């Protein structure tokens, strides 16, 4: 109902925990940390997060009718393209931050102060974006179009950028009619409104991972370190 | 050495500006308003405060006794691999954090918050380790040495690592034999707290190649390729 918005709706809640099966097993309400700083256990958490958090978009990609018969490169060039800014707006929509909770794909939920050492300030602010995300309340046949509509786009370098095109447009239009099924132009114009907070998010992660580097306390996953490196203008 | 302490202190002040000279012809201490976030002004400043201490500090490292023995790989290796920090203590030193006033080695003189915008934050924890180095009232003599100590350490890559160690064991002498020459006999608590002074040092230098990575990330205006070398040399991935 119809098709396209049927599977792209079933790839994003399949991407993601049920309430069910939302995983308390660390969680801690308080946590004493020492801010400003960070050991091997934050710095490898952080890392695991960003990896796990890549595998599952995959997935999630592998998904969206016509993405998997893409060219190899032109699906690793999305996926990594888009990596860090579906990560945050995936965390921002599924997290609590009225109760100052991230959940992540995994289940696994952790208070912002058990982030805090990690991640450092990126996670306040992601938190913050959740709440400005939560306030458009964007349904989830939406937010799966959307979300969608992240990974497929114009990037430098595609080899079949007109195939891409052609799934953008189709996306836009599944898009375009759930909002007027559901209706009975805005919501949108005030969304693509928080784009630039979404790309200062972007930006404190690239900047997160510089500094993390620079510690060097763990090294990062080969694919989280090309993805930053692949990232940089220079 | 002695003699050393005497090179050293030459070297220091010969590196900077007369009181006399200060140029205060572009301090304002109100800015008209802060917001939004640096424009490109902001960014080519911070790089042309920067540029501007590259000959200044090199010209002073060529007066340290012994700089000039070590290899040319390795004068080349301590001076970009220190040059951060160099620029961090000196102007630390030289400003007057009480004021709010950053004081450059050309002579300019310049409010924090003509500065706030191109520097970022660093600006703020540059000025918290010149509060804090101040009060450790530093003498011109003792300073003369823990710059050049800054300098002149073990670096990955050296060739001549055991040399460098000797000439800074030779001004790390210089520097506890004039602590207990000013500060009481025959003893040290006041050296260690200089020498102190040098892994927060460090970790100042961090936040300057952080601030360094966010503007090449932005890139309203490019590094000039001297400050973007140092910056590529000595990011350790």
């Not at 098709?3 to 995983?23: E, I, Q």
């Not at 800014?85 to 599924?94: G, H, M, S, T, V």
């Not at 891409?164 to 189709?170: F, G, I, K, M, S």
């Amino acid at each position: 109902p119809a098709n396209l918005l049927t599977s792209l709706v079933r790839a994003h809640l399949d991407s993601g925990p049920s309430t069910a099966k939302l995983d308390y097993s660390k969680f801690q309400e308080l946590v004493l940390p020492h801010f400003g700083k960070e050991d091997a256990g934050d710095v490898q958490q952080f890392y695991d997060l960003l990896s796990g958090s890549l595998e599952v978009i995959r997935k999630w990609a592998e998904k969206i009718p016509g993405f998997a018969e893409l060219s190899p490169a032109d699906q690793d060039l999305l996926l990594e393209s888009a990596f860090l800014e579906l990560f945050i707006l995936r965390l921002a929509y599924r997290s609590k931050p009225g109760e100052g909770k991230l959940i992540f794909c995994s289940g696994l939920v952790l208070h912002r102060l058990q982030c805090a050492r990690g991640f450092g300030d990126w996670i306040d602010s992601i938190l913050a974006f959740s709440r400005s995300l939560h306030s458009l309340l964007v349904d989830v046949p939406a937010f799966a179009c959307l979300s969608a509509l992240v990974l497929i786009t114009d990037r430098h370098g595609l080899q079949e950028p007109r195939r891409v095109e052609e799934l953008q447009n189709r996306i836009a239009s599944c898009l375009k009619e759930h909002v007027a099924a559901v209706a009975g132009a805005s919501c949108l114009s005030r969304l693509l409104g928080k784009l630039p907070e979404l790309r200062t998010l972007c930006t404190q992660g690239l900047q997160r991972i510089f500094y993390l580097k620079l510690e060097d306390l763990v090294p990062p996953p080969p694919i989280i370190d090309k993805i930053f490196m692949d990232t940089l203008p220079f």
